Design a binder for this molecule. Structure first.
Ligand SMILES: [Ca+2]
Ligand SMILES: [Ca+2]
Length: 74
């Protein structure tokens, strides 16, 4: 049962990571969110996190890939 409200909240969450609005999440953008949680990862640690959900091999996180991260934390 997929609603427009569901889609809107997912969009809101993606947008919190994708600050510059170009549709992909970079290590810089991931780092800003993790440091706000209280963590302090290195650049390489941030790339190992992307590598985990990077289903198309392009090095950064896109919308469907972000959706699988959300599915795992729920
Ligand atoms: Ca971006
Ligand atoms: Ca990707």
């Amino acid at each position: 049962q997929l609603t427009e409200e569901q889609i809107a909240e997912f969009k809101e969450a993606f947008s919190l990571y994708d600050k510059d609005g170009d549709g992909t999440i970079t290590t810089k953008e991931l780092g800003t969110v993790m440091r706000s949680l209280g963590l302090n990862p290195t650049e390489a640690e941030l790339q190992d996190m992307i590598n985990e959900v990077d289903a198309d091999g392009n090095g950064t996180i896109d919308f469907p890939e972000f959706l699988t991260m959300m599915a795992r934390i729920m």
